[PDB]
Amino acid sequence: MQDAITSVINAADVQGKYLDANSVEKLRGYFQTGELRVRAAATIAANAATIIKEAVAKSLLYSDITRPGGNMYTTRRYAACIRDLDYYLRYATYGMLAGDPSILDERVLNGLKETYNSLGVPIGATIQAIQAMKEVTGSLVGSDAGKEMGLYFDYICSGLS
Amino acid sequence: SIVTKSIVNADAEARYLSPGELDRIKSFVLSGQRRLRIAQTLTENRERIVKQGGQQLFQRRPDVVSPGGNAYGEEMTATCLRDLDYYLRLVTYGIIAGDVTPIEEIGLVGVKEMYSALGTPISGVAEGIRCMKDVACSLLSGEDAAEVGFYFDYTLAAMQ
Amino acid sequence: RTAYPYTGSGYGSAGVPYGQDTYGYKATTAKSITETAAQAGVFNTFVKLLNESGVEKLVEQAGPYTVFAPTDDAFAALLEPHSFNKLATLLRPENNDALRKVLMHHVIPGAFTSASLMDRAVTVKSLAGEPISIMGLNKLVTAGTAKVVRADVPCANGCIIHAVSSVIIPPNYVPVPQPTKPVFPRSVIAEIAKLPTPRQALGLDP
Amino acid sequence: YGFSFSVLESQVKNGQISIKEFVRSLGKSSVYQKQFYQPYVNSRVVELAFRHFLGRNLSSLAEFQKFFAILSKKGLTGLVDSLINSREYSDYFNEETV
Amino acid sequence: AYDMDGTGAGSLEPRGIKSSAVEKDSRCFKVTFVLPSQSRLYTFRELQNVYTTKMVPFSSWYAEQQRIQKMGGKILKVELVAGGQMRSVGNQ
Amino acid sequence: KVVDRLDSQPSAAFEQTKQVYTFSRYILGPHRAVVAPVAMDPSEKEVVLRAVYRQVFGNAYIMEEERAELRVMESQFLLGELSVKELVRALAKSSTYKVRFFEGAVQYRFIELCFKHLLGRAPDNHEEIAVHMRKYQQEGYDAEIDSYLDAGEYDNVFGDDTVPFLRFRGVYTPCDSFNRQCALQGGWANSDKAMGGAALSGYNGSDGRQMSTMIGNYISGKPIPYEKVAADTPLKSTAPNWYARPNPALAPQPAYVSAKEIAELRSRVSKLEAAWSVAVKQSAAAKDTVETWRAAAKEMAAMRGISPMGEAYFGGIAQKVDNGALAQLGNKASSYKKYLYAIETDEVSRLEVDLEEAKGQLRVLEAAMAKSTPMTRTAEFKTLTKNVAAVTAAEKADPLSKRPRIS
Amino acid sequence: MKSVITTVVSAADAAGRFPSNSDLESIQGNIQRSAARLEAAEKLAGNHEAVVKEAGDACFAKYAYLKNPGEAGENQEKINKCYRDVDHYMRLVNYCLVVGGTGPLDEWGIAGAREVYRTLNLPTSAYVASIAYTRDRLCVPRDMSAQAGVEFSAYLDYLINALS
Amino acid sequence: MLDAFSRVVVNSDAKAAYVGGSDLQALKSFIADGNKRLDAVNSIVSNASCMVSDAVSGMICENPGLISPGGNCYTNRRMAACLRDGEIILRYVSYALLAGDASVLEDRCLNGLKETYIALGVPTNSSIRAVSIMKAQAVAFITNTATERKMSFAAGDCTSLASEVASYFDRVGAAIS
Ligand SMILES: *[C@H](C)[C@H]1/C(=C/C2=NC(=C\c3[nH]c(C[C@H]4NC(=O)C(C=C)=C4C)c(C)c3CCC(=O)O)/C(CCC(=O)O)=C2C)NC(=O)[C@@H]1C
Ligand SMILES: *[C@H](C)[C@H]1/C(=C/C2=NC(=C\c3[nH]c(C[C@H]4NC(=O)C(C=C)=C4C)c(C)c3CCC(=O)O)/C(CCC(=O)O)=C2C)NC(=O)[C@@H]1C
Ligand SMILES: *[C@H](C)[C@H]1/C(=C/C2=NC(=C\c3[nH]c(C[C@H]4NC(=O)C(C=C)=C4C)c(C)c3CCC(=O)O)/C(CCC(=O)O)=C2C)NC(=O)[C@@H]1C
Ligand SMILES: *[C@H](C)[C@H]1/C(=C/C2=NC(=C\c3[nH]c(C[C@H]4NC(=O)C(C=C)=C4C)c(C)c3CCC(=O)O)/C(CCC(=O)O)=C2C)NC(=O)[C@@H]1C
Ligand SMILES: C=CC1=C(C)[C@@H](Cc2[nH]c(/C=C3N=C(/C=C4\NC(=O)[C@H](C)[C@H]4CC)C(C)=C\3CCC(=O)O)c(CCC(=O)O)c2C)NC1=O
Ligand SMILES: C=CC1=C(C)[C@@H](Cc2[nH]c(/C=C3N=C(/C=C4\NC(=O)[C@H](C)[C@H]4CC)C(C)=C\3CCC(=O)O)c(CCC(=O)O)c2C)NC1=O
Ligand SMILES: C=CC1=C(C)[C@@H](Cc2[nH]c(/C=C3N=C(/C=C4\NC(=O)[C@H](C)[C@H]4CC)C(C)=C\3CCC(=O)O)c(CCC(=O)O)c2C)NC1=O
Ligand SMILES: CCC1=C(C)/C(=C/C2=NC(=C\c3[nH]c(/C=C4\NC(=O)[C@H](C)[C@H]4CC)c(C)c3CCC(=O)O)/C(CCC(=O)O)=C2C)NC1=O
Ligand SMILES: CCC1=C(C)/C(=C/C2=NC(=C\c3[nH]c(/C=C4\NC(=O)[C@H](C)[C@H]4CC)c(C)c3CCC(=O)O)/C(CCC(=O)O)=C2C)NC1=O
Ligand SMILES: CCC1=C(C)/C(=C/C2=NC(=C\c3[nH]c(/C=C4\NC(=O)[C@H](C)[C@H]4CC)c(C)c3CCC(=O)O)/C(CCC(=O)O)=C2C)NC1=O
Ligand SMILES: CCC1=C(C)/C(=C/C2=NC(=C\c3[nH]c(/C=C4\NC(=O)[C@H](C)[C@H]4CC)c(C)c3CCC(=O)O)/C(CCC(=O)O)=C2C)NC1=O
């Protein structure tokens, strides 16, 4: 659980040296985007339910995962999805603010693909839901902010694959 | 034994052994010469301690050997004395270990489940061990009879 | 930046997650003894002899064992003119009795990896009951007359499997005799005549 | 008081045992029973167990007698293992959440 | 003390999990399992990881293994990491 | 000048052993000189005779029942009128040296056997053999050995007093002259009836051909491969029995090598080799965090020195002094002993142990992939999804041949 | 003669080294065993005539074919040269019990003897039948002491091993 | 070579007698002072390389002609070889004192030595003196009367072993005379 400042301090500390010009050079780069990330995390908090409603209706709302037998069939199973998609849109918001994807694999990625295989959750439909959820998130926060929030979505999709 | 559970006691408490624990491991090993003599007496007296043990057991509990009793006939009576040979053996372990830890996890833990599941009256086997105790303590002096009898009555307590 | 980095998170971290993969306590992936050997495709007579002889229940157990399972070329190498004397009699279907000890001499209580045998000579008895000397010198390990082929195979219960080149026979193992004829003395007067009388023992007679 | 369970902070910080394991071993510790077991009655020990290993009070009368008889027969090591091994622990806290 | 005092059916403490663990047992397993909660959709509590691998003692593995299946869990692998086998004395 | 003079110059006046033989592998094992005394007990004449039969016959079974032509050449030596040089010349002219190492031997196998038997070394270069080839073919074998032991080599390094031995001479004039040495004198077990294969080609172990290996190494400049110089090897016999942290003794070759085990091991020894070259540039200055303040904490601490024992009384207590060379710098017993514990605790040495440990595991795993077509494989690993493809269609490396049909 | 002292200052001469602490420590064992191996040196010397008589006719007891004509032990001048030869071998055992090595045996009884007994057609199995009679006549508390008998019956089957 | 035990056996082999109790009282006195003989060889080889430099440089300050130009200890090659043959001889006396018999000294070291030094141009009478300095140091170290190093000993007598090593040093002196 490290942000961009924590990761910069760790690497500069792990060699026992002070924060030289290169370490502060990245820190200044993070502070420049500090204004963009909060407004990105602002609108995502507002439209959390709307984004997840848009992703599932655009990716896996009508294809066979929903029909009996597929999976989301039962209401407990459908309700687990939007609960499950809420974490991806939420933890991706944390990575967008912290500027470092360490929180994702610390709290989301580890034991995740090993868990879906246990339950039998389709990893293929899961990533496309997150990809569609990444597509709507670029709608709200804009282009570059969508590039930032989108940079952690595919990090989840990559490791979850 | 006293050595293994004085360790696992101080093991759980994240500490070493106190003088109270190490002056007794010390006191127990100097006691070890006298313990082997006591267990050596019961070792080759099992012929009398068991056979006279089942002597008083049948005179005090003729139901268990009478027709309908659990130890009825030539067969069950042989096994009727076999268990007494077991428990007499475990008392020799407890005397040398200086504790009922050998008797605890052998012949005591879950003993009521076995004898209830075998149809044997558990109170009857408790009477058998008491009859062995009077024979055992009659074979030793007063200083020893406070030990050899001491392990039997623990087995009597846990067996009811 | 140091090469042997480490695990953890937060400050004082090297950029590598805990446990190198974010798992502190990793679930194992090995199988047990007899089907780690079943997957190897070389211990075929070994796993089959275990299943028939009933020894395979023993090396099912969770105790840390160090099996010295011989590859079937070792079993195929049992056609010595010498070793066929002391081992062919086990092929008979009633002599499962000795087959369990001879197989039980290959199980060693403890997890002795080859790296743990750096120029060390330590003995131990098997689960058969008789001592065996494991010797590791000059990067070549030995278990009796083993001359181990493959170094180690990690198994389920912290157990190790070494591939040996031959079959270790226990030290005080005598081969079972072949099934014979119960012979009886034809006469009775050829045996009273075979016993020395008391008058013979004192030299009173020839 | 400068107390220390270095072995338990070991086996939980590495993930060798759960928080539930670390909590159960804390309950069967001797610094616990000197604190919340020795000065009290088996009656009062049962209620003080629920505040600690369940985060709530006893609910009914039969929930007392089930858990008093367990403590009545197995003491502290039998009671805390019967709370940590219940379903109500697992529904709220399984292996990771204090 | 131990869990086999004589309790069975028709006894005063309620019929429950009875483990064959000795006095202060020192055997413990290394288990691995997933256990979906099956109760979050009417309680709406926060979510916790259900795939765990941990060392449970021999004194309470049976209760835990009996309970992991109570709530539909699946046990992927268990081992006896610490302790002996067929050991009369010494499990303490 | 660490070594003043080699072994080929004689030992001058002031040493009992030559300077190269002190710190080589001469002193460890049984390849020493057993030089004859002036007058000696017939037991001590048997000691110098048994070393001659070990050396000039090369652990051959001399079959003491016969000793047919031997006992005339023995009795010239037991009188004393035959030198040890003249005994070892006369043994190399007999029939039982000819029927072992000449009647079945190639003239490469014979010259390389006379270098091991008569001299100590191996043949160094090519034209060193080409002298002894042309000297045999024009003068014969009896005038070969007479022209072989009476050059400038034997009379300096053994004289006429000592028997020959394997000359671990330290300075080797090609570097392969140590490699062909240990490949010829093959350990304490192997004899030259075995090494040349004269028994297995023999008709009932008799009158077989003494064929030779290493003929490709004397023609072209090509080193001996390392398995013949490390496994069946006299360095195992004169082994120091150290704790050598890269262990030089090669592991026995494993059955069932897999390509999946090698292809991660080659990536691991490229990982350590690229990380060693980074960490060795930062050594000894920037890895020492206490080094930067040594210029100041060495002049801050040069105040109120105490000449006898006793002062720094500090308000009236004892608190004395140590005044040695060590504790005037404040160091302890844990301050010079920190050099002995620099295998685990170091960083540059942490890489170079596992570099040579895993390259030594690589060089016996890769060399065990000289067996291809009928070899039964196995899968000791859990058959994971990691797999390199078989994409070997077109040219990927293509070593630069700029003269493709240049004519 | 190969002894304790002569084998430890020959190897020290072979290295070009002073007598070190390993060389002195080997000769400390020469002082410890000499209380036993000289008690068998004076017990054998005092009774060498009855031992060589009782072992001489044990040679001809097992091998009674030697008194046939054409053989080695045919007439009385050759049997008298036989009992001298067992007396030489019992003299060298008393010689090599005093020295402490096999020095008197390896120089005066062993070396070249495998060529002499082939040349004069002497049966070496009849020598080792007479020595092994003395090895099994040895009563360990009666003939000598216990460790003197171990020192005496270690040197006789050195002579049995090198002959056959 | 022989020792103190294999001397009396080959003396008894010339008369073909068994080694009985008339001869065994002289050998059981050899193992009686076996501890003093090991305490005497240890006192010499512990001070061995400083005994020869005491003696070779003690020869130079008594006769300064050896380090004159064209002498025989003038060159560093000749001075270092003179220390070499000083400690060869002191090694070979300490074999003979260890064996208690001179039959390792007279045939491995002394045999052919006088004929060697005439062939090398080594002056003989100065090498008598370098041996005779070591004869004073061998009887001083064995009797523990060295004036600047006393070694630890259990107290008693060594005038036999000091005389025994002094008989071995003028065997070297009589050989190269
Ligand atoms: C066949 C090429 C031979 C031949 C074979 C026969 N053997 C018969 C009986 C027999 N063979 C053995 C030895 C074998 N059985 C073993 O268990 C083991 C190893 C321990 C070996 C090597 C035994 C012990 C017996 C039984 C002895 C007896 O009862 O006499 C046999 C007769 C029985 C049958 O045919 O089933 C035959 C024909 N005999 C031949 O003439 C050819 C050359
Ligand atoms: C030193 C900077 C190395 C190192 C060297 C060691 N070399 C050892 C033996 C040895 N070295 C050579 C090389 C050299 N000698 C030659 O004669 C020639 C060419 C004609 C060359 C270039 C040779 C051939 C040998 C073997 C000779 C012998 O040992 O007798 C050595 C001793 C190992 C041992 O005694 O077992 C060492 C330690 N070691 C180092 O760590 C640095 C890198
Ligand atoms: C009698 C039990 C033997 C036996 C003895 C014969 N030995 C004959 C000759 C002989 N033996 C030796 C070896 C012996 N002499 C020594 O001086 C020493 C030790 C220093 C030993 C061990 C020698 C050297 C000789 C030849 C000269 C000699 O006669 O002494 C011998 C005469 C054979 C002949 O003249 O053809 C006999 C009969 N032979 C037997 O029957 C049993 C085995
Ligand atoms: C020093 C106290 C002498 C002296 C000695 C010199 N000796 C020179 C060469 C040399 N020395 C010996 C003696 C030594 N070597 C042995 O092997 C043994 C006995 C086992 C002994 C006593 C020998 C044999 C040789 C010749 C062989 C060699 O080179 O070592 C020598 C060098 C002469 C030169 O370089 O021209 C010297 C100076 N000379 C003295 O003045 C005092 C008396
Ligand atoms: C060099 C070594 C050495 C010896 C072996 C004896 C040698 C020796 N002891 C006996 C003689 C004897 N030796 C024994 C002793 C025994 N008889 C047995 O059957 C038992 C095995 C054993 C009892 C322990 C007895 C009882 C006699 C007298 C009768 C006999 O010859 O057997 C004889 C036969 C002539 C005689 O009676 O003296 C000889 C040569 N002395 C020695 O100096
Ligand atoms: C011109 C120079 C010159 C010398 C250097 C001395 C050399 C010298 N020293 C000793 C005599 C001796 N020399 C030594 C040798 C040594 N003492 C030790 O303790 C060390 C081990 C070793 C020196 C490193 C010993 C032990 C004695 C016997 C007396 C003694 O020192 O206690 C003797 C013979 C007896 C005597 O003369 O008193 C001589 C000639 N004399 C000289 O004229
Ligand atoms: C391996 C190496 C090795 C040794 C070095 C010797 C060590 C040694 N020296 C003596 C023992 C002795 N050493 C001496 C000798 C002397 N005392 C003097 O005062 C004189 C100066 C000097 C005479 C040369 C004497 C007199 C004794 C005691 C008498 C005796 O033991 O016989 C003893 C017997 C006493 C004891 O138990 O310590 C031993 C073991 N032995 C060994 O095994
Ligand atoms: C914070 C990191 C984190 C994640 C991501 C997580 C996931 C997780 N998803 C679960 C179930 C589930 N997840 C799904 C999801 C899906 N079905 C589909 O078809 C889609 C592809 C997908 C929605 C995108 C379903 C249907 C279940 C219920 C499975 C069942 O009842 O068997 C469960 C079982 C228990 C429960 O839901 O109460 C866990 C623990 N836990 C975590 O700690
Ligand atoms: C070391 C601890 C230990 C004990 C005690 C033990 C008991 C034990 N008692 C048994 C049987 C038995 N035990 C009895 C005993 C009795 N009948 C009476 O009347 C008396 C009251 C009483 C004996 C004093 C009888 C009759 C049987 C046979 C029951 C049957 O055949 O159904 C059996 C089944 C047969 C056997 O395997 O022996 C066991 C295992 N095992 C143990 O390991
Ligand atoms: C009772 C048996 C037992 C042992 C031995 C044990 C070890 C153990 N050592 C640990 C860490 C550690 N251990 C070390 C040790 C070392 N660093 C070095 O350079 C040295 C070579 C070595 C000291 C000798 C370090 C530095 C950590 C912290 C690692 C980290 O923060 O990533 C951890 C992680 C959790 C924690 O410490 O709280 C455990 C569980 N647990 C046990 O139950
Ligand atoms: C509901 C499904 C289910 C089963 C079946 C189950 C079995 C189970 N059997 C156990 C032990 C045991 N089981 C046995 C059984 C036997 N010994 C024999 O010789 C016979 C072949 C066999 C009786 C048929 C024994 C002796 C132990 C104790 C082992 C020990 O103390 O090491 C244990 C260890 C803990 C304990 O008993 O408290 C468990 C968890 N758990 C479950 O949840």
Question: Domain containing G23 — which CATH number?
Answer: 1.10.490.20
Q: Which residues pair with F328 in a beta bridge?
A: none
Using the beta-carbon criterion (under 8 Å), do B12 and D30 form an inter-chain contact?
yes
CB H127 within 8 A of CB H150: no
DSSP-based three-state secondary structure for B65: coil
Residue count of chain E: 92
**CATH number of H98's domain:** 1.10.490.20
CB G12 within 8 A of CB G22: no
Ligand nearest the Cα atom of residue C89: 1
**Of G32, G159, G7, which Cα lies nearest the Cα of H2?**
G7
Distances (CA, A) of C108 to B150, C103, C134, C157, F138: 41, 11, 10, 14, 67
Domain that residue G23 falls in: 1-164
Residue found by looking up tokens 């003794």 in the block: F249
Interface check F267 vs G, CB under 8 A: no
Distances (CA, A) of F303 to F297, F299, F300, F322, F323: 11, 8, 7, 16, 14
Ligand nearest the Cα atom of residue G74: 3
Residue found by looking up tokens 């019961």 in the block: B42
Pairing between β-strand E51-57 and β-strand C131-137 as defined by DSSP bridges:
unpaired
- Local structure of residue F374 (DSSP, 8 states): S
Ligand nearest the Cα atom of residue F349: 2
Q: Tokens for B119, please give them.
A: 């149809």
**Of F246, F268, F248, which Cα lies nearest the Cα of F366?**
F268
Pairing between β-strand C140-143 and β-strand C150-154 as defined by DSSP bridges:
unpaired
Measured CA to CA, the distance from residue A102 to residue G39 in angstroms comes to 87
Residue count of chain F: 407
Measured CA to CA, the distance from residue A90 to residue A44 in angstroms comes to 9
F258: left (phi over 0), alpha (psi -120 to 50) or beta: beta
Q: Measured at the alpha carbon of residue A140, what is the angle toward residues A137 and A141, in degrees to the nearest 5?
A: 85
Please name the residue whose Cα sits nearest to atom 7 of ligand 11. E62
**Of F266, F290, F229, which Cα lies nearest the Cα of F359?**
F266
**Of C70, C67, C76, which Cα lies nearest the Cα of C104?**
C67
Q: CA dihedral in degrees (H1, H6, H11, H15; nearest 10)?
A: -120
C183: left (phi over 0), alpha (psi -120 to 50) or beta: beta
Residues with Cβ within 8 Å of residue D51, at least 6 apart in sequence: D57
Indicate the number of domains in chain H. 1
Interface check H42 vs G, CB under 8 A: yes
Please name the amino acid found at residue G24: L
Using the beta-carbon criterion (under 8 Å), do C27 and E77 form an inter-chain contact?
yes
Q: Tokens for F352, please give them.
A: 């170079």
If you measure CA to CA, which chain C residue comes closest to F256? C150
Which residues in E lie closer than 8 A to residue C63 (C-beta atoms)? 84-85
Q: Tokens for C197, please give them.
A: 């009388």
If you measure CA to CA, which chain H residue comes closest to F14? H81
Residues with Cβ within 8 Å of residue H25, at least 6 apart in sequence: none
Please name the amino acid found at residue E86: M
Which residues in E lie closer than 8 A to residue A106 (C-beta atoms)? none
Please count the CA atoms within 13 angstroms of the CA of F178 that sit on its side-chain side.
12
CA end-to-end span of chain D: 22
> Known binder of ligand: residue A157?
no
Measured CA to CA, the distance from residue F33 to residue F18 in angstroms comes to 11
Measured CA to CA, the distance from residue A133 to residue A48 in angstroms comes to 11
Using the beta-carbon criterion (under 8 Å), do E34 and A76 form an inter-chain contact?
no
Please name the amino acid found at residue A17: K
Measured CA to CA, the distance from residue C167 to residue C159 in angstroms comes to 20
Indicate the number of domains in chain G. 1
CB A70 within 8 A of CB A64: yes
Please name the amino acid found at residue H143: T
By Cβ distance, the residue of A1, A14, A15 closest to C10 is A1
CB A114 within 8 A of CB E30: no
Measured CA to CA, the distance from residue H78 to residue F14 in angstroms comes to 8
Interface check C27 vs F, CB under 8 A: no
Which residues in E lie closer than 8 A to residue C158 (C-beta atoms)? 81
| Residue F267: CB atoms within 10 Å | 9
CB G80 within 8 A of CB G146: no
Please name the amino acid found at residue H152: S
Distance of CA F268 to the CA centre of its chain: 28
Measured CA to CA, the distance from residue A86 to residue A107 in angstroms comes to 14
Q: Tokens for G68, please give them.
A: 């046939």
Distances (CA, A) of E55 to A157, D8, D28, E79, G19: 32, 12, 16, 9, 64
Please name the residue whose Cα sits nearest to atom 3 of ligand 9. B107
Q: Is the CB of B80 under 6 A from ligand 9?
A: yes
**Of D18, D92, C23, D21, which Cα lies nearest the Cα of E71?**
D92
Q: Which is it for the CA torsion B34, B36, B39, B44, positive or negative?
A: negative
Q: Which of ligand 8's atoms lies nearest the C-alpha of A70?
A: 19
Measured CA to CA, the distance from residue D89 to residue A16 in angstroms comes to 45
Q: Rg of chain G's alpha carbons, rounded to an integer?
A: 18
CB G158 within 8 A of CB G102: yes
For helices A34-46 and A75-98, the axis angle rounded to 10 degrees is 160
Measured CA to CA, the distance from residue A123 to residue G122 in angstroms comes to 96
Pairing between β-strand C131-137 and β-strand C140-143 as defined by DSSP bridges:
antiparallel
Q: Which of ligand 9's atoms lies nearest the C-alpha of B107?
A: 2
CB H105 within 8 A of CB H171: yes
Q: Which helix (H) or strand (E) holds D71?
A: helix D62-84
Please name the residue whose Cα sits nearest to atom 14 of ligand 7. H36
Method: cryo-EM
By Cβ distance, the residue of F254, F278, F379 closest to C150 is F254
DSSP-based three-state secondary structure for F91: helix
Q: Is the CB of G85 under 6 A from ligand 3?
A: yes
If you measure CA to CA, which chain A residue comes closest to C18? A106
Which residues in C lie closer than 8 A to residue F252 (C-beta atoms)? 139-140
Counting ligand 2 atoms within 8 A of each CB, the residue from F18, F172, F179 with the most, and so the one to mutate, is F172
Q: Is the CB of B79 under 6 A from ligand 9?
A: yes
> Known binder of ligand: residue B131?
no
Domain that residue H83 falls in: 1-177
For helices B32-43 and B46-60, the axis angle rounded to 10 degrees is 60
For C62, list phi and psi in degrees, rounded to 5. Answer: -85, -5
Q: Rg of chain E's alpha carbons, rounded to an integer?
A: 16
Pairing between β-strand C120-125 and β-strand C131-137 as defined by DSSP bridges:
antiparallel
Using the beta-carbon criterion (under 8 Å), do E52 and D85 form an inter-chain contact?
no
**Of C143, C136, C154, C45, which Cα lies nearest the Cα of C91?**
C45
Measured CA to CA, the distance from residue B60 to residue B52 in angstroms comes to 12
If you measure CA to CA, which chain F residue comes closest to C137? F249
Q: Is the CB of G82 under 6 A from ligand 3?
A: yes
> Known binder of ligand: residue H50?
yes
Measured CA to CA, the distance from residue C197 to residue C204 in angstroms comes to 10
Which residues in C lie closer than 8 A to residue D9 (C-beta atoms)? none
Interface check E77 vs C, CB under 8 A: yes
CA of H54 from ligand 10 middle (Å) equals: 61
Neighbours of chain G (3+ CB pairs under 8 A): F, H
Distances (CA, A) of F302 to F295, F296, F313: 12, 10, 17
Which residues in H lie closer than 8 A to residue F44 (C-beta atoms)? 1
Residue found by looking up tokens 């005491």 in the block: H54
CA of C61 from ligand 11 middle (Å) equals: 14
Ligand nearest the Cα atom of residue H87: 4
Q: In units of Å, what resolution does this entry have?
A: 3.3
Using the beta-carbon criterion (under 8 Å), do H34 and G30 form an inter-chain contact?
yes
DSSP-based three-state secondary structure for E57: strand
Residues with Cβ within 8 Å of residue H47, at least 6 apart in sequence: H137, H141, H146, H149
Using the beta-carbon criterion (under 8 Å), do C62 and E76 form an inter-chain contact?
no
For helices G21-32 and H34-45, the axis angle rounded to 10 degrees is 180
- Local structure of residue F254 (DSSP, 8 states): P
Distance of CA A161 to the CA centre of its chain: 14
Distances (CA, A) of F195 to B56, F166, F209: 85, 17, 12
Measured CA to CA, the distance from residue B5 to residue B99 in angstroms comes to 10
Q: Tokens for D90, please give them.
A: 């697992």
Which of C13, C18, C29 to mutate against chain A (most A CBs within 10 Å)? C13
Q: Tokens for F162, please give them.
A: 């000592």
CB F36 within 8 A of CB F50: no
| Residue F50: CB atoms within 10 Å | 13
For helices A21-32 and A4-14, the axis angle rounded to 10 degrees is 180
Gaps after which residues in chain F, C–N over 2.5 Å? none
Using the beta-carbon criterion (under 8 Å), do E54 and D95 form an inter-chain contact?
yes
Please name the residue whose Cα sits nearest to atom 27 of ligand 6. H137
Q: Is the CB of C89 under 6 A from ligand 1?
A: yes
DSSP string, A33-80: THHHHHHHHHHHHHTHHHHHHHHHHHHTSSSTTSSTTSSS-SHHHHHH
Measured CA to CA, the distance from residue H171 to residue H138 in angstroms comes to 14
Interface check G12 vs H, CB under 8 A: yes
Distances (CA, A) of C2 to F280, F286, F291, F340, F348: 11, 12, 18, 21, 9
Residues with Cβ within 8 Å of residue H56, at least 6 apart in sequence: H79, H82, H83, H86, H130
Q: Tokens for F40, please give them.
A: 């000696």
Residues with Cβ within 8 Å of residue A69, at least 6 apart in sequence: none
Q: Which is it for the CA torsion H161, H165, H171, H173, positive or negative?
A: negative
Q: Is the CB of H76 under 6 A from ligand 6?
A: no
